[PDB]
Amino acid sequence: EISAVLEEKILGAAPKENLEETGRVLSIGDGIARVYGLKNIQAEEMVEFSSGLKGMALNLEPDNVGIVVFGNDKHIKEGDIVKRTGAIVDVPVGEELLGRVVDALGNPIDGKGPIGSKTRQRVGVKAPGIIPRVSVREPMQTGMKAVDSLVPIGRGQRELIIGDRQTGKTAIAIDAIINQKRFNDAQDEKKKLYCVYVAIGQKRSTVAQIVKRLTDTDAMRYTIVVSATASDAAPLQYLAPYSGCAMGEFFRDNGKHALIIYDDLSKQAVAYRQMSLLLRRPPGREAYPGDVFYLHSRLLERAAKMSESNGGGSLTALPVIETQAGDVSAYIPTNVISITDGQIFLETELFYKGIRPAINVGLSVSRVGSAAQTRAMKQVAGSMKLELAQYREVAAFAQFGSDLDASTQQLLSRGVRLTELLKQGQYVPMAIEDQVAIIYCGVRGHLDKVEPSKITKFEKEFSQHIKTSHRDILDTIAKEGQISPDTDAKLKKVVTDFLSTFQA
Amino acid sequence: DYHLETERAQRQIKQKNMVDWIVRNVMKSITPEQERLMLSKCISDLKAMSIKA
Amino acid sequence: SNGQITAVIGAVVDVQFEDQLPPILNALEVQGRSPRLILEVAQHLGENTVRTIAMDGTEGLVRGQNVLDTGAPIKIPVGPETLGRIMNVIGEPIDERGPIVTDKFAAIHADAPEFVEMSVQQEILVTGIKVVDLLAPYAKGGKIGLFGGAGVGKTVLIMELINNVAKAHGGYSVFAGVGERTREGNDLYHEMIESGVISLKDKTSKVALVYGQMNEPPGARARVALTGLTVAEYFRDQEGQDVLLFIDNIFRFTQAGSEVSALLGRIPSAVGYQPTLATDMGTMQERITTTKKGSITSVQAIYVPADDLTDPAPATTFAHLDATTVLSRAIAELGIYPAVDPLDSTSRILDPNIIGEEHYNIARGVQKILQDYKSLQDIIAILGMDELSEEDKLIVSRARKIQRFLSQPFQVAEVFTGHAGKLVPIKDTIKGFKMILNGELDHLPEVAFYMVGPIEEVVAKAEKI
Amino acid sequence: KAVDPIQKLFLDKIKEYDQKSKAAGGKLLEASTEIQRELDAELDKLKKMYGGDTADLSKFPSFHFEDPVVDPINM
Numbered sequence A: 001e002i003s004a005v006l007e008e009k010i011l012g013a014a015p016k017e018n019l020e021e022t023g024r025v026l027s028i029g030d031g032i033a034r035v036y037g038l039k040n041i042q043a044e045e046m047v048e049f050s051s052g053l054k055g056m057a058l059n060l061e062p063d064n065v066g067i068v069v070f071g072n073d074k075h076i077k078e079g080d081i082v083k084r085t086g087a088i089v090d091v092p093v094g095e096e097l098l099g100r101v102v103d104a105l106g107n108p109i110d111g112k113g114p115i116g117s118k119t120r121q122r123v124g125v126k127a128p129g130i131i132p133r134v135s136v137r138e139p140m141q142t143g144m145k146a147v148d149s150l151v152p153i154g155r156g157q158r159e160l161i162i163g164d165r166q167t168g169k170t171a172i173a174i175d176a177i178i179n180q181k182r183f184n185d186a187q188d189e190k191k192k193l194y195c196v197y198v199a200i201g202q203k204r205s206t207v208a209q210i211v212k213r214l215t216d217t218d219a220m221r222y223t224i225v226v227s228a229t230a231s232d233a234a235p236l237q238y239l240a241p242y243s244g245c246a247m248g249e250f251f252r253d254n255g256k257h258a259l260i261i262y263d264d265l266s267k268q269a270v271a272y273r274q275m276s277l278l279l280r281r282p283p284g285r286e287a288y289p290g291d292v293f294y295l296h297s298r299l300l301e302r303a304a305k306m307s308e309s310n311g312g313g314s315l316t317a318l319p320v321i322e323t324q325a326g327d328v329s330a331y332i333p334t335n336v337i338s339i340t341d342g343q344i345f346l347e348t349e350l351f352y353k354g355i356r357p358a359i360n361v362g363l364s365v366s367r368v369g370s371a372a373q374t375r376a377m378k379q380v381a382g383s384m385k386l387e388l389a390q391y392r393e394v395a396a397f398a399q400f401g402s403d404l405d406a407s408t409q410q411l412l413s414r415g416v417r418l419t420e421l422l423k424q425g426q427y428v429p430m431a432i433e434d435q436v437a438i439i440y441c442g443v444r445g446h447l448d449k450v451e452p453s454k455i456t457k458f459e460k461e462f463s464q465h466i467k468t469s470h471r472d473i474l475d476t477i478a479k480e481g482q483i484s485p486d487t488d489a490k491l492k493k494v495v496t497d498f499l500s501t502f503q504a
Numbered sequence B: 001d002y003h004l005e006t007e008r009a010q011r012q013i014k015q016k017n018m019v020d021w022i023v024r025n026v027m028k029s030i031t032p033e034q035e036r037l038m039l040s041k042c043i044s045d046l047k048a049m050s051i052k053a
Numbered sequence C: 001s002n003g004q005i006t007a008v009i010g011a012v013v014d015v016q017f018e019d020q021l022p023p024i025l026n027a028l029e030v031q032g033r034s035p036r037l038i039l040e041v042a043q044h045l046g047e048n049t050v051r052t053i054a055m056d057g058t059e060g061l062v063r064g065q066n067v068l069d070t071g072a073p074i075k076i077p078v079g080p081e082t083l084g085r086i087m088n089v090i091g092e093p094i095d096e097r098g099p100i101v102t103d104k105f106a107a108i109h110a111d112a113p114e115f116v117e118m119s120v121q122q123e124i125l126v127t128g129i130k131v132v133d134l135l136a137p138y139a140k141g142g143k144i145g146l147f148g149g150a151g152v153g154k155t156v157l158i159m160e161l162i163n164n165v166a167k168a169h170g171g172y173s174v175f176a177g178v179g180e181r182t183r184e185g186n187d188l189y190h191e192m193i194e195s196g197v198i199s200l201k202d203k204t205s206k207v208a209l210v211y212g213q214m215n216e217p218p219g220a221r222a223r224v225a226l227t228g229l230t231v232a233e234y235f236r237d238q239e240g241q242d243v244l245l246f247i248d249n250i251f252r253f254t255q256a257g258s259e260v261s262a263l264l265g266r267i268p269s270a271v272g273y274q275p276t277l278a279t280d281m282g283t284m285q286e287r288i289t290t291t292k293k294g295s296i297t298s299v300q301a302i303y304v305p306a307d308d309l310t311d312p313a314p315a316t317t318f319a320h321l322d323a324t325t326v327l328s329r330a331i332a333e334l335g336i337y338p339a340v341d342p343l344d345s346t347s348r349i350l351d352p353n354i355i356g357e358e359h360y361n362i363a364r365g366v367q368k369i370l371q372d373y374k375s376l377q378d379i380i381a382i383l384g385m386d387e388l389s390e391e392d393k394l395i396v397s398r399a400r401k402i403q404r405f406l407s408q409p410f411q412v413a414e415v416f417t418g419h420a421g422k423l424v425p426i427k428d429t430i431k432g433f434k435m436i437l438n439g440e441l442d443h444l445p446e447v448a449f450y451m452v453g454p455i456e457e458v459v460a461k462a463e464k465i
Numbered sequence D: 001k002a003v004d005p006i007q008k009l010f011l012d013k014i015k016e017y018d019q020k021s022k023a024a025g026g027k028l029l030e031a032s033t034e035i036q037r038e039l040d041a042e043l044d045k046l047k048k049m050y051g052g053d054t055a056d057l058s059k060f061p062s063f064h065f066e067d068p069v070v071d072p073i074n075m
């Protein structure tokens, strides 16, 4: 068995010796190798060093070729042999990468064997133009109540997850990946969504714990993890968002739908700033190069919703940006805000108070908006958005309002229930029917008698009663696609029956 | 799961053991007559690549 | 003649010629490329070698690849055949509707019109936006800038200007998408074909679209504004039309110039910008003007980096504009939309002899109350509202009512706000602010002044409460 | 169609390893001490992880069940 596999790997790995156009390393240092030779080499062509490291031909000069090393530059010495790969920089793509953890070059790192991909795709492909795109009209279900109602994400949208450190940015992104299991297990392939998680500059232990979480929840079957951790070279962390984007662009161009998370692009900008400063390029704002905007703009513009003449596929991007002391006016976050289609802002102050996810409702924007959410969610979240705005205006009167009007007290009481409604535990994403029912109960006044400290327990028990005793209500909602006034009266009665049965 | 992990652990140590055994056996088995035959094959392969043009 | 590629570094390509060098700004065509790769000559390096800027990606270029000299700068189609079409920086149609069949072509590099060919007349362009029409009115024929950061609202503001001004306009329009979202280009294109401004059936289209977006290389992003100018310059000069030119956004032209300048071997200027920041901007902006042959009303969205108005690229753009509209993030975080800063937007036609005595006095009266409010806000922040009893509290109450009344729901923002869009005549605007300044509406709540266009909707909202 | 002599030599070393391993009853051939320590560490970890000390995991586990608890009639 093992001997047969070992024998067929020896026989299958034929050397195929032939003369290759080669170069010679002149000087190596600061992640840049200057190579003498390679007359017929192309710009941005991948090379092979004698130690096995890959590199990208960045600068073509009359006398030398500047090569960006995809690895540690201690493996390259002056006078080494640099061979042309003959191809511009590309990574393996396909459905053979699902369930596999790879580095920025596409090589597996989880030890599960090689990757049997038959296709490769360039990492520097330009984004689709005006014509092949179409409007974003299919929902992206993150499973988060506060996201899917107030900052609704569509398929083909770029939604920024921005905040300070340890505010739940990875928690939102991972729960969005886990939530797609209910759609991937179903037979409806148009709602199926593949996932690509790109870890840039993170800790390798953190990536391993993420892969364990995806494996336990069975979310790894449709997920590709591209890992360029903090121990990896800056060119590897620079390349990894484009490598993962190419793997996600395989699904976009083949009629399927993919979600990609760049966690985080602020660390990729640091890696690119390191490469730019070691190339003597003129620093700008916060020592960043001038093309650090084009670094993220050429990446995120490849996340698009394609027209029916292009297969109808899509790529959805969730870039992550870490701020410093909640400063969204800094250079790098302002660049990504000008690129993406809206941002989800996470507050440190809300995170300290126990509000998780600590989403700032007033500072979270979805430029697509209601155009990419279901009728039932849009009809209810429109009312909740108005009521949260009303609660926000009168929140200043709660500080000293010992005596307050009945209308203002109702607005304060409703806003407290709605704020407690949006709280959600980690690694427990919710189906869209469960989200609609819970938000509908809190927005119609059913929770005005329920204490805010018992809303989460009411959320489990009342949904269980609906899922067991009143399944005909859900069937009517699923058939109609919205909430009828007849169903509104029925939901009023079963809420009154449920609260009376719990206590009287 | 216990039998699968036991099989995987035994497979891994057997793969490691056979790798170092092959490396040591290949390195220790060097003969000059075979070395000259491989040298002649390398020259013939170089001559074949020169013809292939 | 025929050249060969000597060096490829990013968007900058060095080409060496044998017999005769092409002049600066000439267009060069690379031979072995399946799509057209255009190089624009930037400087002569010596030894019969020129340094060029590529208008597309430079991957796959080898040294010694043959480069052909076209003998002319980048020439793009111009005329009625470009109406309803989308073209890129080099004039190729990117709307998948076939070639742009025309006999008229024009180089994207042209000299600005001389001092003799200048029009000094100034007439107010009524928009329907209360903060714009009152405090910084736009001139009918003139340069308008929309300064703002990221997310404060400039695309929404420039789409509202297209909805209000360009729909009822006796002339042609040009949109130059410069380094912005391709999604926004797809949204605007389908907005035009739905509003009838672009006709795919017949030749009744009225707008020409030129798009070089943020996915394009720095050479394309630093020249696609010149392509939109060249289409608008043909309409102004060779047809005598009154042209609308919307550029979104002009900062990306300057930003892409800084990215190329790093590879051109220049000593960097302040904040890492190109040394030629003001001269390249001045050459581009002086071509966008109204002459005696025709008029161009230009609205230019201007991105400010890190919300900094002292950055060299927005600061040098301020002197090129008749009317400036500075959008503030602090105002946008208060929920006031459009987030125009009242004490930072100028018009250059805010004159009693141009817009009238009553319009000028109300605008100056509004700015005086808002400047007094800003002076008092430090006492309000730390101590509180207890200051000067009747007098300063009346100043605060009126200024907060004015700040709410400057906000207005937009028809283009109606999708994600729910409030119906309002187009407010300028007579109703000056009447509404005169009522607030006279103290006629001190008894109304300040919530009634928020997100309602006419002053009659303010009192109707107050009665509803 | 001549094969690489190194490939033939590698196949001979695989066959030589397989013949010597089957002649050793599946045991390792000239394994070092650290490989023996690695194998014992993996077996001990699997024994502690799956609780092989209490019961034989190779055979069927001996279930020790009990009667379910039923509440009294009244409170």
Ligand SMILES: Nc1ncnc2c1ncn2[C@@H]1O[C@H](COP(=O)(O)OP(=O)(O)OP(=O)(O)O)[C@@H](O)[C@H]1O
Pocket: A164, A165, A166, A167, A168, A169, A170, A171, A172, A356, A357, A424, A425, A426
């Ligand atoms: N909704 C939630 N419920 C409970 N715990 C949560 C929730 N969201 C986040 N957390 C916890 O808060 C901590 C920080 O969240 P997370 O690590 O996802 O943030 P981050 O922004 O990725 O931080 P980093 O700077 O490490 O990337 C974690 O321990 C996570 O388990």
Ligand SMILES: Nc1ncnc2c1ncn2[C@@H]1O[C@H](COP(=O)(O)OP(=O)(O)OP(=O)(O)O)[C@@H](O)[C@H]1O
Pocket: A337, A338, A339, A365, A366, A367, C148, C149, C150, C151, C152, C153, C154, C155, C156, C157, C303, C337, C338, C410, C413, C417
């Ligand atoms: N007039 C408005 N009414 C309501 N909301 C607005 C208005 N203008 C802007 N906004 C809000 O601000 C967001 C940003 O819109 P817009 O795209 O116009 O900003 P921008 O300045 O062009 O930013 P970017 O740098 O991303 O292009 C909108 O999606 C909306 O949420």
Ligand SMILES: [Mg+2]
Pocket: A169, A170, A171, A263
């Ligand atoms: Mg994180």
Ligand SMILES: [Mg+2]
Pocket: C154, C155, C156, C180
């Ligand atoms: Mg914009």
